[model samples]
Target chain A: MKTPEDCTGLADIREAIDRIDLDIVQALGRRMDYVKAASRFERVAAMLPERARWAEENGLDAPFVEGLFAQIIHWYIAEQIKYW
Target chain B: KTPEDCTGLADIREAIDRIDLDIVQALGRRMDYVKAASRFIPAPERVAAMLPERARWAEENGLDAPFVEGLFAQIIHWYIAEQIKYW
Candidate 1:
């Protein structure tokens, strides 16, 4: 995998980000598998703030983190219920 | 252990719970790279170029490509919003 430094142009960076994103999707797929394997819950609602909390610790945007996890939780809940 | 290797609900949740934590760390890693990547290009085409490519990736990865695209779009918006402040 090329480091961001090694990427010579926009497409290179694009491809690199895709690689990371693919891993993320694969991980999400696994998370889906777990949720599907036996069933689910509401802990995710409670989990959101810490996901956002790290935004402060990491100097990242709080809304972005919260938004990211909000969408993730939504996806998981929907997927979880569909099979349940 | 692989997802199939999970023996029960608790194990599955344990694996998933850890995946939740694990994903953020990777995202944090990506965030660092994006800050460095800020040094590269700073405009419209880079993002336009990415959305479809990521959507393609999402479909191949068994996700809703458009949803992934939507997420990417927002993340880019935020990153770019901050990036321009330095310009």
Candidate 2:
């Protein structure tokens, strides 16, 4: 949430990073909430193509995105398995 | 940017790339602070106290605490070694 201009020195910069890290953690936690709530396998599977397309369009290394998402999806499936 | 703000794949991907770049830059900024912090605290204390507390705080915030700890451990290891060169 802090801009580089806001930091005066080491202490300020470190504190800002700490704040950002917490924000990232909370964001990921929120993503997890959505993933948990999504009940349909078909809906999940359908997202992959759109994700891949978006990755490609964004000029991201397509294979890297694919690999990253694959692992993320695997994690989601594992979590879902725990409930089932 | 929200996903809804993106009209198509291109827009979404651009947003993702922007975010990723921001993340990389933030990490770089963090490293600068890490190096600067070498001036204030002893390396041993950082290893024993501050780093563990950071990991614990990360876990409390719903992060993968061990992963965060492990990442910081590596960063701290290198930073400490570098600090020793000046000490």
Candidate 3:
């Protein structure tokens, strides 16, 4: 079935979903790279790393994005230590 | 002086802070897009969308099912509403 946005056809909806999924993945990857850079920056600044700084600076205050970034950063750092 | 401990010390913290700031920036960028997507959301009535599936998925993943799911759903609903107002 197709949502109103893709009433043209199921195939259209599938295609749109695929495109959006790619966008989402790319966006996420870019965010990770940004976080990696952030980690490096924090180390250089000699300032205590603060999540609030990230939230306030980036306009990502909404609960979803905030929580997502916090968790993602934590996971990312963990993976770095785990894998490397 | 046998060289201070500030070599990687300060740099490390600075890098972390910068990266954290960068992540926030990226999040803001992503949310800008989400804001646009939210405008198409109809209203509370049809807003259920894939919430049921989301609930099931959260439970299956052994997430803090209730708190985390509710929090995110509430956030999405509010975000959409905000976008509606913005647009």
Candidate 4:
């Protein structure tokens, strides 16, 4: 059987990982704001916004990027659903 | 609802929410592997290897046959579509 992956030296690498994690958190925070803005724009336009347009304008792949955006966007949708 | 008296319940709920957040992070990490796998898979037909056999085994084991097959096939279809559209 194949051996399990080891984390024996993870402590030594943890700081670098922490830095990358912080970057991810910050980048995602910015993306959330962008999506929120797009949603607000869609509301103002009085039309359903296309996710592919958002991804393309943002220079992202539609399918993978849409998956990420969907998760974040659903958080806002869920809040709206909760109140509605 | 917010009060010192409810601190214990709030703490427990916060901890559970943190755990759920970790699950989201783990899923994000797993998507990296999915992206890599997509690079190697050209088409759905080219990739449909052992999943049907696995589904058959699952059916033989008394699992919900139609439900399992339907759910997995749908999931696999979406995954392959994602590969074609993305990675």
The candidate that achieves the highest lDDT relative to the unseen native structure: 1
* Model 1 alpha-carbon drift over 4 Å, by segment: A2-15, A40-42
Name the regions of candidate 4 deviating beyond 4 angstroms: A1-84, B1-30, B42-47
What tens-digit string does per-residue lDDT give for candidate 3 at A1-84?
A: 234343354344333433333343343444444344443325213222356555666665545555654565556566456343
Q: Write the per-residue lDDT of candidate 1 for residues A1-84, one digit (tens) a residue.
A: 777677676566666666776677777767777777756436676678877776656667777778898898788778878786
State which candidate has the highest DockQ.
1
lDDT of 4 by residue, B1-80 (tens): 22222245344334333433443343344333344443233244533643464356445544434533443454346545
Count of backbone collisions in candidate 4? 0
lDDT of 1 by residue, B1-87 (tens): 566776776677678767776677667656656666666644687667778987887777678887888887877787677666645
Off by over 4 Å in 2: A40-74, B1-44, B47-50, B62-64, B71-87
What level of docking quality does candidate 4 show?
incorrect
Judged by whole-model lDDT over C-alpha atoms, candidate 4 comes out at: 0.40
Candidate 2 iRMSD, 1 decimal = 6.9
Between candidates 2 and 4, the one scoring higher on TM-score is: 2
What are the models' TM-scores?
Answer: 0.80, 0.46, 0.40, 0.31
Per-candidate RMSD, Å: 2.8, 7.9, 9.7, 13.4
Residue B67, model 3: lDDT of: 40
Ranking by DockQ: 1, 3, 2, 4
Ranking by lDDT: 1, 2, 3, 4
Worst window of 10 by summed lDDT in candidate 1 chain A: A37-46
Q: Write the per-residue lDDT of candidate 4 for residues A1-84, one digit (tens) a residue.
A: 111122233232233333333333443343333333333224312111344454455443446544544444455455435343
- Candidate order by TM-score, decreasing, is 1, 2, 3, 4
Candidate 1 CAPRI classification by DockQ: acceptable
Task: Specify the highest-TM-score model's number.
Answer: 1
